[PDB]
Amino acid sequence: AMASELDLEKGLEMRKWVLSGILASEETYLSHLEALLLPMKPLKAAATTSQPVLTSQQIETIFFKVPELYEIHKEFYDGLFPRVQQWSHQQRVGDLFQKLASQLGVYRAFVDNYGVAMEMAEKCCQANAQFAEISENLRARSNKDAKDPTTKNSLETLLYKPVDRVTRSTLVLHDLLKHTPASHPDHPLLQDALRISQNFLSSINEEITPRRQSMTVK
């Protein structure tokens, strides 16, 4: 048995609302993220055919996990879809979140070479037209660089877009936890994944924006 349909619906609705917020943000994000791995596949082969625009060493440091991060998120998300209309018969959700926390070490490996990646990327744009064009056509929202004393956006900014959202995705674990009863083991599980996910970004707080107003000077 379980509770009546009229009682469980209150929980189904609310849970669906929060989970759907992730499927919704990830769906649209994943679609745009795929546009990056799309040319990456043939470019990986290009590293061993004729003479490509950039060397594999210059590609691999930037694209270190670009396609992996797409699959890691879509596996979680695409498997969430059927599950919203098929809440398990006598089980809860948490292992899907645990998987994201499990592989968090790769997110650090990328940050461990963030500077090195931008250092090559900035040079790659001036050094090659095909890298310059994609770096100009940078798929993004409106900017405040067409009238300001600043200049165009660099590779650092494009990599920082997903990173900012990933720092905010820890809040969903904190929100979910609040609604979950403490008496159930589901509470400390959500708490545990939140501990490592928050500490990871907090340990690089000054790395990913040292101060609120930091821009280059002449």
Curated annotation (Swiss-Prot):
Modification Phosphoserine, positions: S4
Positions of modified residues (Phosphothreonine): T157, T209
Domain DH: start-end pairs: 14-207
Function: Protein with a unique structure having two opposing regulatory activities toward small GTP-binding proteins. The C-terminus is a GTPase-activating protein (GAP) domain which stimulates GTP hydrolysis by RAC1, RAC2 and CDC42. Accelerates the intrinsic rate of GTP hydrolysis of RAC1 or CDC42, leading to down-regulation of the active GTP-bound form. The central Dbl homology (DH) domain functions as guanine nucleotide exchange factor (GEF) that modulates the GTPases CDC42, RHOA and RAC1. Promotes the conversion of CDC42, RHOA and RAC1 from the GDP-bound to the GTP-bound form.
Subunit structure: Homotetramer. Interacts with PDZK1. May interact with CCPG1. Interacts with FES/FPS, ABL1, PIK3R1 and GRB2. Interacts with HCK. Interacts with SH2D5. Interacts with DLG4.
Disease implicated: Leukemia, chronic myeloid: A clonal myeloproliferative disorder of a pluripotent stem cell with a specific cytogenetic abnormality, the Philadelphia chromosome (Ph), involving myeloid, erythroid, megakaryocytic, B-lymphoid, and sometimes T-lymphoid cells, but not marrow fibroblasts. A chromosomal aberration involving BCR has been found in patients with chronic myeloid leukemia. Translocation t(9;22)(q34;q11) with ABL1. The translocation produces a BCR-ABL found also in acute myeloid leukemia (AML) and acute lymphoblastic leukemia (ALL).
Domain notes: The region involved in binding to ABL1 SH2-domain is rich in serine residues and needs to be Ser/Thr phosphorylated prior to SH2 binding. This region is essential for the activation of the ABL1 tyrosine kinase and transforming potential of the chimeric BCR-ABL oncogene. The DH domain is involved in interaction with CCPG1.
Protein name in UniProt: Breakpoint cluster region protein
Gene coding for it: BCR
Portion of the parent chain present: 487 to 702 of 1271
